[PDB]
Amino acid sequence: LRELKRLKVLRLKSNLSKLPQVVTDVGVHLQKLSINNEGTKLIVLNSLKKMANLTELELIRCDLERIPHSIFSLHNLQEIDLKDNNLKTIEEIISFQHLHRLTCLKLWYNHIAYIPIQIGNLTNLERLYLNRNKI
Amino acid sequence: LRELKRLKVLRLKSNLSKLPQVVTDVGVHLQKLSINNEGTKLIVLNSLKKMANLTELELIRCDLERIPHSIFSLHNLQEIDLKDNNLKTIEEIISFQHLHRLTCLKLWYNHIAYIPIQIGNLTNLERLYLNRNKIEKIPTQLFYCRKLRYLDLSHNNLTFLPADIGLLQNLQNLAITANRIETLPPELFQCRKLRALHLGNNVLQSLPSRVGELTNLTQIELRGNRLECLPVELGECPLLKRSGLVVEEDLFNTLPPEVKERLWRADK
Amino acid sequence: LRELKRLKVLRLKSNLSKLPQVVTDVGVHLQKLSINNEGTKLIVLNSLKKMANLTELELIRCDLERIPHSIFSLHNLQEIDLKDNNLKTIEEIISFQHLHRLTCLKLWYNHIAYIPIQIGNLTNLERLYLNRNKIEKIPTQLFYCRKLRYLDLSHNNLTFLPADIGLLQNLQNLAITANRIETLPPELFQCRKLRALHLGNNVLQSLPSRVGELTNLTQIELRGNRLECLPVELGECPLLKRSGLVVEEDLFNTLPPEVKERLWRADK
């Protein structure tokens, strides 16, 4: 994968235990990464900090169980999708306030019981999807 | 050929040493003659003077090296194309002042160093192409041609655009591509009728806010610049669409989401 | 041919050096004769005087080079067609004033430079076609022909329309296509009976409000202009429909939504 130096989009639906090192090595020019892990637990291992060029991230069906803090360094993010992570509390959004272009948050099909109050500091939001939850 | 009594257009691409006598004999009714000689020298021999009905003449790649003076008797000419004749000075255009329907002059890929001043007396011009030449300055007299719609000055050695560009009240589209212009004069926006402005692949450092005033803008080039963001006022253009705002995507992303939504609506 | 004693129409397209004697001998009962000689010179010679019953004459592509004077004795003529005779001056029309039923004169595709003034004495004219010629101006005397319904002056060298055009009270259709007219005189809308106006592919910058006065207008061309929007007063034409509003689509979009709604209902 190191030889494909102009790739802007990689999507993998491969039941992956971890994110490949080689993907994050190729992350210099990648713009959107999408992993559909089908409920298999994905390990991020801080490599994700290199993807400063990332504007849209989808970590789908990865049984993450925690919003990774590495997101907070990715100051260009516009969209996040967290399909199927059994999320009940989303307090970590307090630190999303520094992601100035974040306009679309997609947290469907989780076990969220309430919306934390700090959401009001996410003043740039244009799309918010919390459907199919326990609010 | 004499029996083909209704021929209104003849074009020949035949490596000709001279203009055939039979052509000028048939010139009673011919309206357009076009010769592409591919650099082979054409001899005219004054026979061309008989073609009183001619309205468009193209003597293409004939290595003429100077505009002949027989052309001035062709009082019906509307368009001239002088591709690839190594033209350096075009002062003779003063005698074109009597061609009242001359709207299009095509002089690309020559060695022209400057624009003669008498261009201001060609008041009926609508199209002027002087791109791909060696031009150093723009005379202000060009702007007496207030009915111009198309002006192409791309690929010259222009540094700035004079304020007198505000005088083209009938300008609609304009290309000054691939020069080293740093910023646009304000007077450019006196041309209210603009619909397209091709300025990409220059060294622009900033795009003025007054782009918001171009109501009828649908196409604009800004690509190939070291910009970090775009000005919000691009959203103020009513007839513009996402496909029409031709700019790098990372720069495009800087616009408000509302503008991008209106662009989404506009397309479908 | 002598045996066919009831023939009313003979047309010949046969590259004829002369008009046959036998045709003129059979001319007792013939009503319309048409010769298409394909540019071959036709010799009349004094026989044509017998065709007193002729009401319509077409001497087509006959390289005549002169209006034959024998026409002046043919007092029943209603229509004349002189396709392709390289005519530059038509002064002979002064004597057509005695042809009282002449309503249609067809002189296209010639080299006519001007209209002689005596045309005003052709007071019974209802159709006049001088299109595809070299005419530079309109004499006012043309407008004494107050029975004109159709006038075609497309593809000439006209710059303006005289105000005296208001005198054609019976005018219904009119084409001035492919000139360089910038604006229409208001007096043009004194011709109340207009139903179609083909003005496309000109350099018009504005369309006058007085188009509202054309009650019976159903078709009008505006294409090929530098408009940015369209004037609302076209909506003041009662019988106009979307199919009759002949204009570029981008310009059509500029009209008020109400006008487009009325056009939607009007069609179906």
Side-chain angles (χ1 to χ4, degrees), chain B residues 47-243:
Chain B
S47 67
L48 183 63
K49 293 180 183 176
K50 288 184 181 179
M51 294 178 66
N53 195 7
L54 182 63
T55 59
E56 295 181 354
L57 183 59
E58 297 183 355
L59 293 174
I60 298 298
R61 292 176 70 187
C62 295
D63 193 359
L64 297 169
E65 293 181 353
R66 293 295 180 187
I67 296 165
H69 294 88
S70 66
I71 294 166
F72 301 157
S73 296
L74 299 169
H75 64 281
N76 290 319
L77 291 172
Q78 294 182 354
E79 299 186 355
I80 297 167
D81 192 358
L82 296 170
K83 183 187 267 79
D84 190 359
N85 290 317
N86 290 321
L87 294 172
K88 293 181 176 67
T89 60
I90 57 168
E91 290 292 331
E92 291 83 1
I93 66 171
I94 190 164
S95 294
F96 291 168
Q97 67 187 356
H98 296 88
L99 298 172
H100 297 285
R101 249 145 221 106
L102 184 61
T103 57
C104 186
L105 181 62
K106 287 179 170 194
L107 294 174
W108 52 71
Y109 286 101
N110 291 321
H111 300 288
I112 299 168
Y114 63 92
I115 295 167
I117 57 170
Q118 62 270 19
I119 188 164
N121 288 321
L122 296 171
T123 62
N124 289 320
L125 292 171
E126 305 186 354
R127 295 173 66 96
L128 184 64
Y129 288 173
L130 299 169
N131 57 6
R132 301 286 185 183
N133 293 318
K134 291 177 173 169
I135 299 165
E136 292 180 353
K137 67 182 178 66
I138 297 168
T140 186
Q141 292 84 19
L142 190 149
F143 306 104
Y144 299 164
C145 304
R146 296 182 182 179
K147 290 186 181 180
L148 294 170
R149 291 180 64 253
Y150 292 174
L151 181 65
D152 192 358
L153 300 172
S154 296
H155 296 277
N156 279 334
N157 293 314
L158 297 172
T159 59
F160 65 92
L161 293 172
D164 291 330
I165 193 161
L167 292 174
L168 300 176
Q169 299 298 111
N170 284 311
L171 186 65
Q172 290 181 354
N173 297 324
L174 180 67
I176 292 169
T177 300
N179 291 315
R180 63 183 183 176
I181 299 167
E182 294 292 330
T183 58
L184 293 172
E187 292 82 2
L188 180 63
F189 292 103
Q190 290 186 359
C191 299
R192 293 182 183 174
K193 293 182 184 177
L194 292 167
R195 291 186 292 174
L197 293 173
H198 297 287
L199 300 171
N201 290 316
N202 292 318
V203 296
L204 294 172
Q205 293 180 354
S206 180
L207 192 279
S209 65
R210 289 188 67 191
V211 68
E213 290 182 353
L214 298 176
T215 302
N216 299 115
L217 183 64
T218 59
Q219 187 172 5
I220 186 167
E221 282 178 350
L222 298 170
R223 291 184 185 272
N225 292 317
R226 294 180 181 177
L227 293 170
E228 293 293 329
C229 66
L230 294 172
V232 296
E233 291 81 2
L234 295 171
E236 295 179 355
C237 296
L239 295 173
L240 182 63
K241 291 183 182 182
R242 190 178 182 95
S243 66

Side-chain angles (χ1 to χ4, degrees), chain A residues 8 55 78 101 103 124 126, chain B residues 250 253-254 256-258 260:
Chain A
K8 289 184 181 179
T55 60
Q78 295 182 356
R101 295 189 180 89
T103 57
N124 288 321
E126 294 180 353
Chain B
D250 58 357
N253 289 337
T254 61
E258 293 177 353
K260 294 185 285 186

Side-chain angles (χ1 to χ4, degrees), chain C residues 175-222:
Chain C
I176 291 169
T177 301
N179 290 315
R180 40 112 145 264
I181 298 166
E182 293 293 329
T183 58
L184 293 172
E187 292 84 1
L188 182 62
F189 297 100
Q190 288 186 0
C191 295
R192 293 182 183 174
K193 293 183 186 176
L194 293 166
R195 292 184 294 171
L197 292 173
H198 297 285
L199 299 170
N201 289 315
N202 293 314
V203 295
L204 296 171
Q205 291 181 355
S206 180
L207 188 279
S209 62
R210 288 188 62 178
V211 68
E213 292 180 353
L214 299 177
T215 304
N216 296 320
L217 184 63
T218 59
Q219 188 170 5
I220 190 165
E221 287 182 352
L222 297 170

Side-chain angles (χ1 to χ4, degrees), chain A residues 42-96:
Chain A
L42 182 62
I43 296 168
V44 237
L45 240 23
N46 304 297
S47 61
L48 183 60
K49 294 181 183 178
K50 289 185 181 179
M51 291 178 68
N53 196 3
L54 182 65
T55 60
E56 298 181 354
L57 184 58
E58 299 180 355
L59 293 174
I60 299 298
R61 294 176 65 191
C62 293
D63 193 358
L64 295 170
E65 295 178 354
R66 185 182 294 277
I67 296 165
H69 296 87
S70 59
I71 294 166
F72 302 155
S73 296
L74 299 171
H75 65 279
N76 288 320
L77 293 172
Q78 295 182 356
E79 303 181 354
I80 296 167
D81 192 359
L82 294 172
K83 180 181 297 283
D84 190 358
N85 290 311
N86 288 320
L87 293 171
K88 294 180 176 66
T89 61
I90 57 169
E91 290 291 330
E92 293 84 359
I93 64 168
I94 190 162
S95 291
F96 286 170

Side-chain angles (χ1 to χ4, degrees), chain C residues 117-134:
Chain C
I117 57 170
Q118 61 266 18
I119 188 165
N121 288 321
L122 297 172
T123 62
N124 288 321
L125 292 171
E126 294 180 353
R127 295 170 66 96
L128 184 62
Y129 288 171
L130 299 169
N131 57 4
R132 302 286 182 183
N133 292 319
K134 291 179 172 171

Side-chain angles (χ1 to χ4, degrees), chain C residues 13-73:
Chain C
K13 186 177 178 181
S14 298
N15 294 115
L16 299 175
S17 66
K18 67 179 73 64
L19 185 63
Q21 182 177 2
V22 62
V23 174
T24 60
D25 294 331
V26 171
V28 174
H29 59 282
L30 182 64
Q31 292 181 355
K32 184 178 179 180
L33 184 61
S34 179
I35 301 299
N36 188 355
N37 203 2
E38 295 178 352
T40 299
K41 183 173 173 66
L42 182 62
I43 296 168
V44 233
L45 192 41
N46 197 9
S47 61
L48 183 60
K49 293 181 183 178
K50 289 185 181 179
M51 291 178 68
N53 196 3
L54 182 65
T55 60
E56 298 181 354
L57 184 58
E58 299 180 355
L59 293 174
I60 299 298
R61 294 176 65 191
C62 293
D63 193 358
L64 295 170
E65 295 178 354
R66 185 182 294 277
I67 296 165
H69 296 87
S70 59
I71 294 166
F72 302 155
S73 296

